[PDB]
Amino acid sequence: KELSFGARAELPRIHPVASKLLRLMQKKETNLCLSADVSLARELLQLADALGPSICMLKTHVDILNDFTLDVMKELITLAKCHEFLIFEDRKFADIGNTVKKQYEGGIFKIASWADLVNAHVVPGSGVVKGLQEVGLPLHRGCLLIAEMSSTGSLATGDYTRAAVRMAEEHSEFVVGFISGSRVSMKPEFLHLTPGVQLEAGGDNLGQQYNSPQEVIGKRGSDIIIVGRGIISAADRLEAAEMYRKAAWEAYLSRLGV
Amino acid sequence: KELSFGARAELPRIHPVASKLLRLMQKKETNLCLSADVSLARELLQLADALGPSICMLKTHVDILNDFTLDVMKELITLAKCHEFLIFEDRKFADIGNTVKKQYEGGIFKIASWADLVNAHVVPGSGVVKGLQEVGLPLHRGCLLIAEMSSTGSLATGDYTRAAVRMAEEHSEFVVGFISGSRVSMKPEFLHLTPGVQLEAGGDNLGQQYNSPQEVIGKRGSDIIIVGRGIISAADRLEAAEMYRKAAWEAYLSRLGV
Ligand SMILES: *c1cc(=O)[nH]c(=O)n1[C@@H]1O[C@H](COP(=O)(O)O)[C@@H](O)[C@H]1F
Ligand SMILES: *c1cc(=O)[nH]c(=O)n1[C@@H]1O[C@H](COP(=O)(O)O)[C@@H](O)[C@H]1F
């Protein structure tokens, strides 16, 4: 059998951040990551508080926050601890190792000081991971590698996707899984998180493509759905989050045998 | 014959930002872009002022500035106008179109308000360019596409590089050239800018690889060298910049027939 999230949390080679995430997914019956794509701190924090019980993870783009300060992120941490979710900065690092370490630790945002997870593109080669890990390992953080993208014309296919998987294997002390559209690794230690998710068929006018939670989790074998506009643009964002949570959770149970 | 920078500035299909850059390269006898990889505003501005006459372009990572404010960038603009160089934010956008437009226009940094040029990875497909251009076209800006990377294990090779070139062709109203290690397009309208440049052989401990200006400009056919540590770590950064300027310029002249 495929192992439950709770059993995967105990695997010998599991990363501590992956284990914490898997435990809380199991406890809370949620494999939903909220993509909190808003430009105001007040809305970010109001969403994190109201939707915290429904999510395993809150994904940020702090570079879109108009009123970012480090005190906003301290508050977000308080909510993350209160409601039990991880914070994932969706920074999609994509430069040489020497540069991404600086971008991860420093500047105004100090990402590594508050983000449990970040992600990186594999296009620069494995130095991108080596650079991030210089900062992230001492801070006990984890990283996801972008093995596939949800957008039209994505070049993250075929051998590129295979290279991402190898790179994750080779840096398993820091890399905890993937951003992908589907299961890309057979090794249950790795998490699969999938953006490009809505209940209805469609896309946007700038290349985004959507697939349903049942497709993504149930048929394609991914672990967590990442949902932005499907929730954020809804009138009642709490009920929307609950719809997405129930869809992804039941897809997971049905794949497990439950 | 290959056309001089001055003649390329007049090509029918030249982008206005490319034409301004080419004119100033010609006027100033410089095809050097300073990679101003420092974490303090005072050092950024002191370098921009002292090295401004020697450079065609100053490349930033504002996400590494510890004391970024928009008033720092206004000052940098003053120096850019005074010394005649373009400002290039090396943000290496790599998300879906809807997201990168937000990251380009908004947040704390307001990149599009002060950067003449930005760059983007092609991995997401052409929506990345469509999203940036939503913001950049009305602001009269330009973009470079990352067709090749300088780092060990780069996946930006073969068909990936070819896709970058096609994508540039298809968005020539906004895309003015490439970040690459070599000439990748035959069309003289496109600029080639090459990072991974030092006078001496070597690399760093996080995957960077260096080639010389003579190799990059003279043999590989690129237009502009991008140099960070080769200048920034030197004691006399002005003399280092002049060494790099003379190397790249003479390589260009010798390729032209001069
Ligand atoms: C990143 C990588 C990828 O493959 N797709 C993708 O959409 N992203 C980011 O994920 C969310 C999707 O939000 P949406 O549900 O509103 O389309 C965005 O934040 C995007 F940046
Ligand atoms: C970006 C893309 C790429 O292919 N290579 C590369 O180095 N970058 C960026 O360019 C400079 C190189 O600086 P250096 O001369 O000190 O190595 C860095 O800012 C890096 F981010």
Terminal alpha carbon distance of chain A: 12
Contacts of A1 (CB under 8 A, 6+ apart): A256, A257
Yes or no, beta carbons of A94 and B121 under 8 Å apart:
yes
Q: Among this protein's residues, is A95 annotated catalytic?
A: yes
Distance from CA of A58 to the nearest CA of B (A): 16
Distance from CA of A100 to the nearest CA of B (A): 9
Distance from CA of A166 to the nearest CA of B (A): 12
Residue B95 CA to ligand 2 centre (angstroms) = 20
Query: Which method, experimentally, gave rise to this model?
Result: X-ray
Closest alpha carbon to B128 in B97, B172, B101: B97
* Backbone region of residue A42 per phi and psi (left: phi > 0; alpha: psi in -120 to 50; beta: other values): alpha
Any idea which residue has 């330009």 for tokens?
B142
> Which chain A residue shows the shortest CA-CA distance from B209?
A96
| Upper half-sphere CA count for residue B117 (Cβ side, 13 Å) | 31
Pairing relation of β-strands B209-210 and B202-203? Answer: antiparallel
Q: Does B65 touch chain A (CB under 8 A)?
A: yes
Q: Which of A64, A103, A156 sits opposite B123 (nearest CB)?
A: A156
> How far is A208 from B165, CA to CA, in rounded Å?
22
**What is the helix (H) or strand (E) element at residue A146, kind and residue range?**
strand A142-146
Q: Does B40 touch chain A (CB under 8 A)?
A: no
CB distance B143 to B117 below 8 Å: yes
Yes or no, beta carbons of A96 and B151 under 8 Å apart:
yes
Which residue from B226, B231, B233, B237 has its CB within 8 A of the most atoms of ligand 2, so it is best to mutate? B226
Closest alpha carbon to A108 in B73, B98, B4: B73
CB distance A128 to A97 below 8 Å: yes
Interface test with A, best of B35, B61, B66, B108 (most A CBs within 10 A): B108
Q: Which of A39, A155, A208 sits opposite B122 (nearest CB)?
A: A155
Any idea which residue has 């308000």 for tokens?
B113
Residue A96 CA to ligand 2 centre (angstroms) = 6
| Inter-chain contacts counted by CB atoms under 8 A, chains A and B | 176
Q: Which of B124, B126, B207 sits opposite A127 (nearest CB)?
A: B207
Q: For ligand 2, atom 13, which residue shows the shortest CA distance?
A: B228
Burial of B29 (0-12, 13-18, 19+ CB in 10 A): middle
**Tally of residues, chain A:** 258
Closest alpha carbon to B181 in B141, B139, B140, B223: B223
Reported structure resolution in angstroms: 1.4
Contacts of A173 (CB under 8 A, 6+ apart): A15, A133, A137
Q: Among this protein's residues, is A219 annotated catalytic?
A: no
Q: Among this protein's residues, is B67 annotated catalytic?
A: no
At A151 the three-state DSSP class reads strand
Pairing relation of β-strands A209-210 and A202-203? Answer: antiparallel
**Ligand closest to CA B102:** 1
At A119 the three-state DSSP class reads strand
> Which chain B residue shows the shortest CA-CA distance from A159?
B155
Identify the structural domains of chain B with CATH numbers, from first to last: 1-258 (3.20.20.70)
Residue B186 is which amino acid? M
In terms of DSSP H, where are the helices of chain A?
5-8, 16-28, 41-51, 70-83, 97-105, 127-136, 158-170, 213, 229-232, 237-256
CB distance B87 to B117 below 8 Å: yes
Ligand 1 binding pocket, CB closer than 6 Å: A 35, 37, 90, 149-150, 179, 195-196, 208, 226-230; B 95-96, 99
